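Consortium newsletter contribution from the modelling node. Members have asked for a concrete example of what our holo predictions look like. Here is one, prepared for the 2-acetamido-2-deoxy-beta-D-glucopyranose complex that several groups have been discussing at recent meetings.
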Amino acid sequence: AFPVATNGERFPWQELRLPSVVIPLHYDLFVHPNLTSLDFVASEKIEVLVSNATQFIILHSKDLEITNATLQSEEDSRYMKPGKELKVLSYPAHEQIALLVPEKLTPHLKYYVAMDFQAKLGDGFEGFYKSTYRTLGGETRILAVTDFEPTQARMAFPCFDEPLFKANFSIKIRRESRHIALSNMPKVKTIELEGGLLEDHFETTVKMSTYLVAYIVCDFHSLSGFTSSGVKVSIYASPDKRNQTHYALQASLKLLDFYEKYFDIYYPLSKLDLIAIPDFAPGAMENWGLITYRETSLLFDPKTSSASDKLWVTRVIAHELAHQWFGNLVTMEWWNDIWLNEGFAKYMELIAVNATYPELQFDDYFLNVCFEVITKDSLNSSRPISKPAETPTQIQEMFDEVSYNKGACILNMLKDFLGEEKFQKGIIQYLKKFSYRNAKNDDLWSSLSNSCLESDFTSGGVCHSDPKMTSNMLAFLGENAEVKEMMTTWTLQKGIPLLVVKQDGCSLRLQQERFLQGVFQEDPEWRALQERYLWHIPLTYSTSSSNVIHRHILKSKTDTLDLPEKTSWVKFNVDSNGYYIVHYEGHGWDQLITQLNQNHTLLRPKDRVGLIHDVFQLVGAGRLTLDKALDMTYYLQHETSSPALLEGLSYLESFYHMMDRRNISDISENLKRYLLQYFKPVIDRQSWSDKGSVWDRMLRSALLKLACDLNHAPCIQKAAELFSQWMESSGKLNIPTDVLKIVYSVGAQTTAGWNYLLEQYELSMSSAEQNKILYALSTSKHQEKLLKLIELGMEGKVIKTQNLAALLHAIARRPKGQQLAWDFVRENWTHLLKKFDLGSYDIRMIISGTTAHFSSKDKLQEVKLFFESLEAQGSHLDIFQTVLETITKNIKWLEKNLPTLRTWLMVNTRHH
Ligand SMILES: *[C@@H]1O[C@H](CO)[C@@H](O[C@@H]2O[C@H](CO)[C@@H](O[C@@H]3O[C@H](CO[C@H]4O[C@H](CO)[C@@H](O)[C@H](O)[C@@H]4O)[C@@H](O)[C@H](O[C@H]4O[C@H](CO)[C@@H](O)[C@H](O)[C@@H]4O)[C@@H]3O)[C@H](O)[C@H]2NC(C)=O)[C@H](O)[C@H]1NC(C)=O
Ligand SMILES: *[C@@H]1O[C@H](CO)[C@@H](O[C@@H]2O[C@H](CO)[C@@H](O[C@@H]3O[C@H](CO)[C@@H](O)[C@H](O)[C@@H]3O)[C@H](O)[C@H]2NC(C)=O)[C@H](O)[C@H]1NC(C)=O
Ligand SMILES: *[C@@H]1O[C@H](CO)[C@@H](O[C@@H]2O[C@H](CO)[C@@H](O[C@@H]3O[C@H](CO)[C@@H](O)[C@H](O)[C@@H]3O)[C@H](O)[C@H]2NC(C)=O)[C@H](O)[C@H]1NC(C)=O
Ligand SMILES: *[C@@H]1O[C@H](CO)[C@@H](O[C@@H]2O[C@H](CO)[C@@H](O[C@@H]3O[C@H](CO)[C@@H](O)[C@H](O)[C@@H]3O)[C@H](O)[C@H]2NC(C)=O)[C@H](O)[C@H]1NC(C)=O
Ligand SMILES: O=C(NO)[C@H](Cc1ccc(O)cc1)n1cc(CNS(=O)(=O)c2ccc(-c3ccccn3)s2)nn1
Ligand SMILES: *[C@@H]1O[C@H](CO)[C@@H](O[C@@H]2O[C@H](CO)[C@@H](O)[C@H](O)[C@H]2NC(C)=O)[C@H](O)[C@H]1NC(C)=O
Ligand SMILES: *[C@@H]1O[C@H](CO)[C@@H](O)[C@H](O)[C@H]1NC(C)=O
Ligand SMILES: *[C@@H]1O[C@H](CO)[C@@H](O)[C@H](O)[C@H]1NC(C)=O
Ligand SMILES: *[C@@H]1O[C@H](CO)[C@@H](O)[C@H](O)[C@H]1NC(C)=O
Ligand SMILES: *[C@@H]1O[C@H](CO)[C@@H](O)[C@H](O)[C@H]1NC(C)=O
Ligand SMILES: [Zn+2]
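And here is the predicted structure:
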């Protein structure tokens, strides 16, 4: 048959997508939450318009007791005040309710749908839920906060919980006298009810999707300032943490300005609120006018927050602010095109931080975003940027490295192609065109391809007003359709192309092929995954003679350009701005490496980190033996650009940790030696201080951490000295932030230090400190402590459970812990599920956070079996395949190149 209701009747409607016959225009929403009962009583009146006559209305509701349902109208006199009662049937399987009407409704007539509902405050990071913080005095205090994206709005009021059903919202909220209440838009009025309660009436909203509605009740304080635009920006936090909001304010004002100018679009609201929520699963959520954060994302305290931390805090404020346009002013049509929000937001981070905090050096850190997402696009299990999704759980999965980074990287790839100007003018022509409504994937390429430059040029020139037929316009319309084709290739093909370059004297044979990790070229598995995959890759290259940047658009599977000067080497994808790996056949890889050991300044600094990255990724592909990737780090002795230095190193440091976790002592013991010597010079220049530039500071941290993990006797001596000095000061002497984490994890290696550290985790007012303390706590050798941390996190009283996920991962990466963590997950999967949504980001990082590092044929089968057991019940996530392929990639990489690592390091000890 078809759906059956809770009362055992029927649902008029069978799909989980909603019906487009009734569409909502306005929500009168009223919420009265009682915070000492931990429940809420609410009501709502939805002005709807029906386009096609109907017998039944369909909404979403979940875990919501509905206790009254009427229908009124002022255009259809049958439902004239008071109005006839409706009868509701709940179909909990699609999270839908059906309101059933007495008489067929009239097309083109507005009705008001009214419901009273109630529920207990949720206790789990979604919906309208409870949250606790700690005061400085030791008091513990409660607030209630909403988190809705993507589909939990339906858990706090009945509604049409899809983006595109955009409406206006009117919120009134009732509160005790000791609380305040915030929501999306500033408060108009506060009427005093008679018992002493208060009713906050909020300015009603501009048209917006449901997942963005927010309300909060709490007792936070705030610092306020104004933009040059006239917005009141206010950072809200726990009373005692108010100090820590100053930089949030500083940066968000500067940023909100920048965004307004760059988009040519004012922020539409009158207020903008940043609040720091103590219990909060995401990094932060872009509620229009009321942005919510983990404290670690928004709060900054200078005695304890690191300079990296400030870069982080500046990044997420950049990101959420960008959503005000990309997300709220323009929302994706459906969750397939979620990258239309996140992709653009991740990218604006870069332009906006670079624009407003050049000192934060964020342009040298953006290649990590692409590099990370690349190692997941090197597997078959990867998806494309736009993929269909229908159930809640699929939608949540849609928020991943792909939706965020691949989207942000191909954007930055597009910009280099079109140029900042022509890119900005296409962005404005899109946010302006789709303001207050929705846009699908294609719409974005359309307005970015039909972008005009220098305004309209001459009004009556090359743009839409009274244009002039010229052989430029036929190539402008031709170049416009060229780019709309090329991008659509990037957005619907999974994976990332690898371009093969062969230099045969003035002749370069270009080949493209999907890049694949843990699969060789001579294999049965490889030429069947080269199915139909072909991209329009906009190439770039500089030769060894001239610094000229040539630019060709390869649209074929083979192609040949002609080199005129025919010189020493040729570096493709200059500055690395293009989403693709280049591998040189012949002596190409050999010419470039010698160039690095001779000068190395003959290749621009981005070219280098691209090479370093490209090189090692290609031994993952079998296309290069490991001794040519290691041979490159020899020039790091002279390397002066910190980015290249740190990429080089991490690769080396990855290996050391791969050698531990297994017992590969002799190799691990030699990596330790090839690092501590041969990078001794640079390590020895490092201050134990916060003095220097941002990359100076970052490199000190990176390096001093390296030597103290490798038991380098001096470093561990000095970090100990600072630690006991700190503890013998009862916290009176300050440790420089940049060695703060290193000192705690050196001190943690003893039960004293450790127990003092755990005791001060519970007393610290700086969640930046607490986070560093946790890491240190996690680095303990005893499995007694490690497990106590784990259980403390489950409880959620001492270590708040929002950290459990990340805690498990710190433990599992370290050898004395990888097993404990993996055992704990399997022995508790059911229990862990009651706390998190399978498909929540928290679950996906517990699953891959304890399995991804595995690299032996035995562990693989534990997992394939554990995953199989999960699938058996109501369970399935894409992370299952990606974990497997990754462990596989590691097994292959170990057995193909381990003897070469072993032998390379042995050789090096001979020559020096
Ligand atoms: C969430 O729900 C909680 C309860 O679960 C509510 O808290 C209660 O709120 C009600 C109403 O605000 C309170 O009820 C009133 O309490 C008075 C007693 O207060 C004493 O306080 C001091 C002690 O220092 C004495 O000096 C004083 O004389 C009292 O002994 C009663 O006397 C009240 O009755 C009289 O006054 C009212 C006020 O106008 C009149 O209407 C009556 O006719 C009557 O003459 C009244 O019963 C109750 O005390 C609160 N309890 C607690 C523990 O706080 C929250 O208000 C609610 N919050 C929200 C947002 O909904
Ligand atoms: C629901 O939200 C929409 C926004 O998406 C509201 O539309 C906006 O309505 C206002 C006022 O009706 C328009 O303001 C303008 O102000 C100047 C001031 O003098 C006036 O001269 C203009 O003629 C205009 O009214 C605004 O342009 C409009 N914006 C959009 C995008 O439509 C709508 O009013 C909201 N509905 C309710 C019931 O609140
Ligand atoms: C990060 O911010 C800096 C600061 O604006 C950006 O650098 C600037 O980029 C613009 C456009 O790329 C430069 O304009 C052009 O410069 C070249 C240099 O010769 C010139 O020939 C062109 O005709 C044009 O004037 C601008 O000069 C440059 N400023 C500086 C100080 O370098 C940078 O682009 C930003 N990065 C990103 C990724 O947005
Ligand atoms: C690796 O290649 C770079 C680029 O050629 C080398 O830097 C360059 O070194 C030469 C000297 O061998 C410099 O020449 C000098 O130029 C000044 C005027 O600019 C002139 O007045 C002097 O009499 C002298 O001829 C050249 O300027 C310099 N390039 C830059 C940008 O400063 C680098 O030294 C090479 N690495 C080596 C040789 O180890
Ligand atoms: O950016 C957002 N919204 O626009 C945030 C997440 C965020 C905020 C600031 C950042 O600098 C980066 C990411 N966000 C997602 C959701 C609902 N989906 S979720 O599955 O529960 C989930 C949470 C976090 C997820 C994540 C986190 C890193 C990478 C990939 N993914 S994914 N709510 N807020
Ligand atoms: C909703 O109503 C509209 C308009 O009454 C329907 O649109 C008509 O559909 C028929 C079907 O072939 C066409 O021949 C007409 O030309 C359409 N007219 C208009 C004005 O759109 C629509 O099919 C109805 N859909 C549902 C699901 O009820
Ligand atoms: C539903 O509305 C009617 C209107 O007369 C009211 O009497 C009734 O108490 C309401 N139900 C509730 C508040 O649960
Ligand atoms: C916050 O700033 C004020 C002003 O200097 C100071 O009195 C207070 O002690 C500060 N608190 C912290 C934790 O820095
Ligand atoms: C690779 O992915 C494709 C499409 O997602 C799928 O058909 C194929 O089964 C995958 N490879 C393997 C070995 O299963
Ligand atoms: C490594 O080898 C030594 C040699 O006996 C052994 O005692 C130790 O337990 C091994 N470590 C692991 C993790 O197997
Ligand atoms: Zn986002």
